[PDB]
Write a protein that binds this DNA or RNA. Structure first.
Lengths: 49, 92, 57, 247
RNA sequence: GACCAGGCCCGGGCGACUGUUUACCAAAAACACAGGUCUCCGCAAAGUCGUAAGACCAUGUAUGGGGGCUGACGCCUGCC
RNA sequence: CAGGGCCUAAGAUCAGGCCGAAAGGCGUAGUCGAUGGACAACAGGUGAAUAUUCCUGUACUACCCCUUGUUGGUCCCGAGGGACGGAGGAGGCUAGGUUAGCCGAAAGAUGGUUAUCGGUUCAAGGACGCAAGGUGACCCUGUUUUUCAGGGUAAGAAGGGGUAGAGAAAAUGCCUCGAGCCAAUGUUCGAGUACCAGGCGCUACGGCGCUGAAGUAACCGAUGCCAUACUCCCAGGAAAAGCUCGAACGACCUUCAACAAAAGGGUACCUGUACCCGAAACCGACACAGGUAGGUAGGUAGAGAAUACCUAGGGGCGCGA
RNA sequence: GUGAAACUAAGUGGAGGUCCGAACCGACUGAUGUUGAAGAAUCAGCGGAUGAGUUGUGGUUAGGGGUGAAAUGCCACUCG
């Protein structure tokens, strides 16, 4: 009974983990768009500079 | 009630096709075709005025303004309809 | 340093918030200015910008 | 615990000085944002205890403030006095005994006591003697007034039904906290003041000529013409509640 | 071993100092400064702008807010 | 993708309200107002002028339809959160760089020599998961307390959960369970019948056509991520909406209507998009030895974004002899 | 080192209105340039460069005024 509760809390940990990491990676992508340095074509072409 | 954004005389929402060579490139290469519309137009009003007057499912409606004032509309039809067999009927 | 040059690359939005038609019509004084512009015969009674598009030319 | 949802947020922007935009309270500008602290001057919960959990630095004040809870679910800030033991309990009320930190109306108390936060009339938040060491004493009471020696060397009979937080208010050691970094004046949002001799006659009345100008006028004046030594700036008939100026 | 990359010491005057100042002839010994002192102000505060309502002061309360002069620090600051 | 269809700061306009010869001044609710907060796309190709926009691949948002349950649901209200400082240096790694391995070619008329010359590329996203990094509470033992070895506590983490008061959520007080937690990085799919050195066939000699090898390891090491992570300091570091939770009171609609999901399909609002942008196109009257916010930061020598010479890329400064 | 103090080796730490020096900001000297390349610059050095910093965007105060670390400075190459 208690291990199933630990699996429900673990499932809450997986759902909230995927949501928080999704929000974090999208906000990193917005922080790199706002500086003007996000798209890896515009960085991979400017690897030499 | 279902209002549009603006009531804009729907039998005049399209003005003229474009007969440049790049338009024929869009026909043979894109299954799309080129119209000249007025500035007061939509991706919802032009898109309805193609599936009714022509009888063709239109895929997308890529619009742009042109600095002489008038508006240009690249309309891409569905895969089921060739734009070349529907453009020779009009006169392209 | 810079030079003794006055106008620069300020956005036309901020030039239209000051010298545009709205702050020119929000006062009795500015609409009296438009009495003098329309009374003289100027084709462009304000120097503005547009929130949608740039220029039809 | 910062971000208490009691710091209250929106203010008028920094140490402002603009009435219509004209400089009217001079030498202001600069520093941090200095977000204010909405503290509980007029204690509207009487006869319920409350502990003390945090002594937070209010940047708006010269002293500190403290976060006080209650037995019910609330959070307030009050001026903590000298002697605020962490975890000590304060309680406002009408018959609450005298302790360094709690509040009570000015009637139900003896005379000759150290009190910081007093009221000049009923209903107000808190007016007098709330700085970083400002302590007001009580001379004996009267029928509906109370002669109170507030920390200017000044006595004042006052309305007796006024709330008062008994205690000597702490952070006295700002008498000796030196500003010796010499640009720390600018961190408080206080621009440098220019002096009247070294101005022009269009600006100040002591706009001089060659050299260190002597003061020239019969009296040292303000930049708006009034004499700035001895001339008491007080309306001749306002209250007549003060007994003697004693200054 | 190229480019790059402190000249220094001995005295004195002024300003303690870092800073700010006459955009386009003056960067200073000038202004400011930390510190000192006098003086006004008890909150419906003083002071400031406005005929007024009102606003800054201040959502602060004499360990605080104006205003005058002097300018760290050390010794003092006399007589009328 | 950037703004508007979302939100507010400074500030502006301010319904009523006060004031004032007039014009208008003050000021609350409210509404505008990005330089901020919220929200979903990357790689290759095409191309006289367009590319996160067009084509192809894999995705992700916001609603509808299709299946299970519910009788209430939405908004206003109550709350959490959004939500924030400066400096400091140490870790863990990525981006880039160098070297080595591998693959292809190479005789470049010189004394010798292959020691030489080019590739060694891959994103967003979907899954699985984190240590020798930080965090996890107290005491003893061994070691420089430390990385670790060992014992005990019943709370001592991320987190959940019960209650008690006028107490739905929250907050406060009490009790209990949980030894782990956090995030860059990472493996696989995307992803090769792509890209790519080379050779193979014609030149409008401007390029197209067919085929295609290896595509790994280690040392450095970021000013980029972890990271609003810790430590220190005073000069004490925005707001609102989106989001999440929830009783009473208040407005509306009610059964195949509303709400919450699980796969699968459908649908995709306006404006900006060229070009110059360390400038001949902007601002200095000039195709003016001047100015203009921000981003990317290769090699060698060097502490270094100075300097000297160079790869990429771009020029030879619009009078010459 | 004494029953505790006062004080000192040694590490750890990274404070500064610290120092050298780039971007950046500013303009001290000198030469050039004076129908200048430029209605205020070029060249060679120069002062600050974690702060009382610099700058972008959106604002604010408007002439019996504003603003001024105070020069009669600045308020569109114009300011008693």
């Amino acid at each position: 009974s208690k291990l199933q509760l630990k699996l429900e809390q673990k499932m809450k940990m997986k759902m909230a983990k995927k949501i928080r990491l999704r929000r974090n990676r999208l906000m990193r992508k917005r922080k790199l768009r706002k500086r003007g340095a996000w798209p890896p074509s515009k960085m991979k072409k400017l690897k030499n500079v | 009630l279902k209002y549009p954004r603006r009531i804009l005389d729907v039998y005049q929402i399209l003005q003229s096709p474009i007969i440049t060579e790049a338009a024929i490139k869009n026909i043979a290469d894109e299954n799309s075709l080129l119209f000249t519309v007025d500035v007061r137009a939509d991706k919802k009003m032009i898109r309805e005025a193609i599936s009714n007057f022509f009888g063709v499912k239109v895929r997308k409606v890529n619009t742009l303004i042109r600095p002489d004032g008038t508006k240009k509309a690249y309309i891409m039809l569905n895969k089921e309809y060739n734009a070349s067999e529907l453009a020779k009927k009009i006169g392209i | 340093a810079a030079l003794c040059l006055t106008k620069r690359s300020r956005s036309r939005k901020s030039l239209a918030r000051t010298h545009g038609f709205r702050l020119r019509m929000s006062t009795t004084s500015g609409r009296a200015l438009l009495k003098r512009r329309r009374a003289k015969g100027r084709k462009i009674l304000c120097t503005k910008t547009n929130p949608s598009s740039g220029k039809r030319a | 615990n910062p971000r208490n949802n009691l710091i209250s947020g929106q203010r008028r922007c920094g140490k402002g000085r603009n009435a219509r935009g004209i400089i009217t309270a001079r030498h202001r500008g600069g520093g941090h944002k200095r977000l204010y602290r909405k503290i509980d001057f007029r204690r509207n919960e009487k006869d319920i205890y409350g502990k003390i959990v945090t002594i937070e630095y209010d940047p708006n004040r010269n002293a500190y403030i403290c976060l006080i809870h209650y037995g019910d679910g609330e959070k307030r800030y009050i001026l903590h006095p000298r002697g605020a033991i962490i975890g000590d309990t304060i309680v406002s009320g009408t018959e609450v005994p005298i302790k360094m930190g709690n509040a009570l109306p000015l009637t139900d108390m003896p005379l000759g006591t150290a009190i910081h936060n007093i009221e000049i009339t009923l209903g107000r938040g808190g007016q007098l003697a709330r700085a970083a060491g400002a302590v007001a004493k009580l001379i004996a009471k009267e029928g509906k007034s109370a002669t109170l020696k507030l920390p200017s060397g000044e006595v004042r009979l006052i309305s007796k039904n006024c709330s008062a937080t008994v205690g000597q208010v702490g952070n006295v050691g700002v008498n000796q906290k030196r500003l010796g970094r010499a640009g720390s004046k600018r961190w408080l949002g206080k621009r440098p003041v220019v002096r009247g001799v070294v101005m022009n006659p269009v600006d100040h009345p002591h706009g001089g000529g060659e050299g260190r100008a002597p003061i020239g006028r019969k009296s040292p004046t303000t930049p708006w013409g009034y004499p700035a030594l001895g001339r008491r700036s007080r309306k001749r008939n306002k209250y007549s509640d003060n007994f003697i100026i004693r200054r």
